[PDB]
Design a protein around this motif. Structure first.
Motif, PDB file in Angstrom:
ATOM      1  N   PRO A 252      -6.656  -6.035  -1.705  1.00  0.00           N
ATOM      2  CA  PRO A 252      -7.006  -6.384  -0.315  1.00  0.00           C
ATOM      3  C   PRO A 252      -8.410  -6.969  -0.232  1.00  0.00           C
ATOM      4  O   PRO A 252      -9.176  -6.857  -1.197  1.00  0.00           O
ATOM      5  CB  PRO A 252      -6.898  -5.031   0.412  1.00  0.00           C
TER       6      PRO A 252
ATOM      7  N   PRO B  69     -11.689  -1.537  -5.408  1.00  0.00           N
ATOM      8  CA  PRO B  69     -10.710  -1.780  -6.480  1.00  0.00           C
ATOM      9  C   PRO B  69     -10.785  -0.705  -7.551  1.00  0.00           C
ATOM     10  O   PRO B  69     -11.799   0.006  -7.643  1.00  0.00           O
ATOM     11  CB  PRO B  69     -11.131  -3.150  -7.037  1.00  0.00           C
TER      12      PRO B  69
ATOM     13  N   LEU C 262      -4.615   2.051   5.554  1.00  0.00           N
ATOM     14  CA  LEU C 262      -5.407   0.948   5.029  1.00  0.00           C
ATOM     15  C   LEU C 262      -5.713   0.018   6.196  1.00  0.00           C
ATOM     16  O   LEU C 262      -4.803  -0.343   6.947  1.00  0.00           O
ATOM     17  CB  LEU C 262      -4.609   0.206   3.958  1.00  0.00           C
TER      18      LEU C 262
ATOM     19  N   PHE D 205       0.837  -1.193   0.000  1.00  0.00           N
ATOM     20  CA  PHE D 205       0.000   0.000   0.000  1.00  0.00           C
ATOM     21  C   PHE D 205       0.873   1.243   0.000  1.00  0.00           C
ATOM     22  O   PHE D 205       1.792   1.349   0.818  1.00  0.00           O
ATOM     23  CB  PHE D 205      -0.892   0.002   1.240  1.00  0.00           C
TER      24      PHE D 205
ATOM     25  N   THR E 270      -7.107   3.292  -7.329  1.00  0.00           N
ATOM     26  CA  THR E 270      -8.325   3.954  -6.901  1.00  0.00           C
ATOM     27  C   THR E 270      -7.958   5.326  -6.354  1.00  0.00           C
ATOM     28  O   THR E 270      -6.840   5.550  -5.884  1.00  0.00           O
ATOM     29  CB  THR E 270      -9.094   3.124  -5.868  1.00  0.00           C
TER      30      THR E 270
HETATM   31  C1  LIG Z   1      -8.381  -0.132  -1.556  1.00  0.00           C
HETATM   32  N1  LIG Z   1      -9.227  -1.137  -1.815  1.00  0.00           N
HETATM   33  C2  LIG Z   1      -8.969  -1.939  -2.858  1.00  0.00           C
HETATM   34  F1  LIG Z   1      -9.838  -2.938  -3.089  1.00  0.00           F
HETATM   35  C3  LIG Z   1      -7.855  -1.768  -3.688  1.00  0.00           C
HETATM   36  C4  LIG Z   1      -7.642  -2.689  -4.774  1.00  0.00           C
HETATM   37  N2  LIG Z   1      -7.500  -3.393  -5.667  1.00  0.00           N
HETATM   38  C5  LIG Z   1      -6.974  -0.722  -3.403  1.00  0.00           C
HETATM   39  C6  LIG Z   1      -7.262   0.086  -2.331  1.00  0.00           C
HETATM   40  F2  LIG Z   1      -6.429   1.118  -2.020  1.00  0.00           F
END
Ligand SMILES: *c1nc(F)c(C#N)cc1F
Ligand SMILES: [Zn+2]
Length: 198
Positions: free
Chosen positions: A58, A129, A164, A16, A137
């Motif tokens: 994720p 996603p 995240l 990330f 994203t």
């Molecule tokens: C957050 N959620 C997600 F599902 C993704 C992917 N692929 C990236 C994110 F930063």
């Protein structure tokens, strides 16, 4: 005073990290990012696109949270909040508490947290996603006070910490950047980068 969340960069299992557009420093710019300073310059309540990059997808239910802290050591235990003027100016969208500095634009699933133990503010959205034809994203943030607002940030630099998280709120990844909210982001980015080069 409050406990201080970590600002340590942590890519975690999904790789990330943040990314920022390349909008330049013209007078018409409302949001501009300096890689040399790791610093976002933006106008009040204007769209700040932040890219979320991962090496692998994720799980469903992953969320992404934004929180501001003061950069300097003598101010980092103080909760970052909107100034006494802006917290009273009745500009809430119906989701964001009027005290919160950081809002998410254009996401009806945004949730705003006043932490019951630390009293810190944050805003969290489902992590989704990338859309078709996109490699990352993007979240749109708004900053709802100027850096210079007296009784609020009071010219003190802040960092935004982006985390995240899984569906329980456990850490999956972390990144951060400095923010200046100002009337002339392009002019101020040019000045601070020029200062750095001297
Ligand atoms: C957050 N959620 C997600 F599902 C993704 C992917 N692929 C990236 C994110 F930063
Ligand atoms: Zn203010």
């Amino acid at each position: 005073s409050s406990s201080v969340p970590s600002q340590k960069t942590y890519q975690g299992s999904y790789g990330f990290r943040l990314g920022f557009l390349h909008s330049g420093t013209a007078k018409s710019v409302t949001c501009t990012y300096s890689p040399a300073l790791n610093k976002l310059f933006c106008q009040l309540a204007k769209t700040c696109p932040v890219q979320l990059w991962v090496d692998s997808t994720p799980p469903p239910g992953t969320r992404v949270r934004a929180m501001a802290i003061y950069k300097q050591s003598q101010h980092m235990t103080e909760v970052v909040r909107r100034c006494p003027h802006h917290e009273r100016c009745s500009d809430s969208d119906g989701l964001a508490p009027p005290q919160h500095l950081i809002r998410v634009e254009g996401n009806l699933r945004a949730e705003y947290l006043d932490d019951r133990n630390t009293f810190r503010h944050s805003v969290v959205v489902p992590c989704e996603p990338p859309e078709v034809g996109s490699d990352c994203t993007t979240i749109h943030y708004n900053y709802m006070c100027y850096s210079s607002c007296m009784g609020g940030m009071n010219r003190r630099p802040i960092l935004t910490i982006i985390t995240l998280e899984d569906s329980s709120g456990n850490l999956l990844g972390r990144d951060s950047f400095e923010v200046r909210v100002c009337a002339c982001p392009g002019r101020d980015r040019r000045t601070e980068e020029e200062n750095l080069r001297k």
